[PDB]
């Protein structure tokens, strides 16, 4: 059976999107639906990651000009955690998935977002937004399989 390679193949990053599959149980056995809430899962705990880095350099005594960026960014995760992904967890799951394709290009979006926060477009914690943005990627197009 090769949907998971299937699946991949039909993603930006075939590497990045085997070894996010590969790496969860559910994925040998699970129908594409399963792949993409494996993928959400993923995208989630990086965002996770993502947004506690945030509070531990907000309450680290960060310089004047990480101020704003940090709080901006905080924003634009607590968008992504609280909404996006339940709302596309909820679309997967109980409705259309439709839906979560929205999700998946919301989360793509305020990743970079938050990036873009910091002068020269450069964060301290560049390789957090960039997974996100990525995972997100790998997600949409996964989902555009479903609708």
């Known amino acids: 059976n090769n949907l998971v390679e299937t699946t991949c193949k039909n993603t930006p990053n ?67 955690l609280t909404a996006s992904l339940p709302e596309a967890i909820e679309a997967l799951t109980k409705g259309d998935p439709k839906f979560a394709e929205d999700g998946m290009v919301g989360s793509s979006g305020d990743a970079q977002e938050c990036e873009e926060y910091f002068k020269g477009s450069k964060s301290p914690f560049s390789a957090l937004n960039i997974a996100v943005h990525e995972l997100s990627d790998v997600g949409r197009a996964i989902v555009r399989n479903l609708l």
Do not use: E
């Not at 993409?36 to 989630?44: F, H």
């Not at 310089?63 to 607590?78: E, V």
């Open 14 to 80: 075939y590497q990045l999107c085997l070894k996010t599959l590969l790496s969860d149980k559910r994925s040998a056995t699970g129908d594409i639906t399963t792949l993409a809430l494996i993928m959400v899962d993923a995208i989630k705990a990086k965002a996770n990651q993502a947004a506690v880095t945030i509070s531990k350099l907000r309450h680290s005594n960060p310089p004047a000009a990480w101020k704003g960026p940090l709080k901006n960014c905080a924003f634009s995760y607590k968008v992504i």
